[PDB]
């Protein structure tokens, strides 16, 4: 396996950018070694692992950034569209249940006047 | 053709890259039995983009 994501989460974003630079330079030298050693393939099971490793550092760097930014715009009108509830285009363009069930004042009085009654006939 | 466009050069490039036989190891891994790319093309007989 490679770098465990949980260990990376504990690191600060400065520590993680340093780790990412080291992993991208490592990938560059593995690509160099794969090109230079053209006649015989060596499997290079460090190459595959460090490709995944770079992704697992990038996932932790985005997760920390999205969570931090989300709290800057938490409880604010007009948050960025990335931080908006996912829904769908139709749902995001639809009346809320309160607005669907809004009744005119005279109709509302009539509903209250005559409540629904449980009744049984025999 | 010597004065090629970039877009055209890149579409033609993929055709050369994908004009490859099935790797022998892939036939062993997949137990393919049939052994020919078929999508392979020959410059004289093929009419790419025609």
């Amino acid at each position: 396996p490679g770098l465990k994501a949980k260990d990376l989460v504990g690191l600060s974003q400065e520590d993680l950018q340093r780790k990412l630079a080291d992993l991208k330079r490592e990938l560059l030298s593995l690509r160099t070694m794969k090109a230079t050693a053209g006649p015989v393939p060596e499997r290079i099971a460090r190459f595959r692992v460090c490709k995944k490793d770079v992704a697992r550092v990038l996932t932790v760097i985005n997760q920390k950034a999205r969570d931090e930014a989300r709290a800057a715009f938490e409880g604010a009108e007009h948050i960025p569209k990335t931080f908006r509830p996912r829904l769908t285009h139709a749902m995001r363009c639809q009346l809320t249940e309160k607005q669907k069930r809004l009744l005119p004042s005279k109709l509302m009085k009539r509903k209250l006047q005559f409540p629904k009654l449980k009744y049984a006939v025999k | 053709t010597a004065n090629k466009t970039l877009s055209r050069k890149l579409r033609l490039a993929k055709k050369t890259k994908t004009n490859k036989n099935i790797p022998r190891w892939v036939i062993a891994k997949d137990h393919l039995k049939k052994t020919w790319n078929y999508k392979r093309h020959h410059w004289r007989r093929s009419h790419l983009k025609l």
Partner: protein, 117 residues
């Protein structure tokens, strides 16, 4: 289709257990000379018929009685027969209050089919 329509009726019956599925509808002489003597269910009781049983349009709708204000009574006999239907239904119907005691609602028994056919 028969199974699907039945399932819909069974779910609706469960939603309002004590309340019967069908509203009380009036006895109407079938239209034309051909069907004059025979009677059939109509849309709703006229306001005059619901003035004879002493009800109001809103009150009748709560006891599950369909009301039609378009329906004009025509003959005096029509008012009397339908007023009698309302009197029979009002005695038959039982209105549960106190929010909902589970036992009284459980023993209510759903009516099935047209009420007062």
């Amino acid at each position: 289709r028969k199974i699907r329509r039945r399932q819909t009726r069974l779910q609706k019956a469960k939603a309002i257990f004590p309340c019967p599925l069908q509203k009380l509808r009036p006895s109407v002489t079938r239209c034309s000379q051909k069907f004059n003597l025979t009677q059939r269910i109509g849309r709703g009781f006229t306001l005059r018929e619901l003035q004879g049983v002493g009800l109001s349009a809103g009150k009748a709708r709560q006891i599950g009685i369909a009301v039609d204000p378009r329906r004009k009574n025509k003959s005096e006999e029509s008012v009397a027969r339908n007023v009698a239907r309302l009197k029979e239904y009002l005695s038959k119907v039982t209105i549960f209050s106190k929010q909902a005691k589970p036992e009284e609602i459980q023993q209510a028994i759903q009516h099935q089919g047209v009420v007062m056919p």
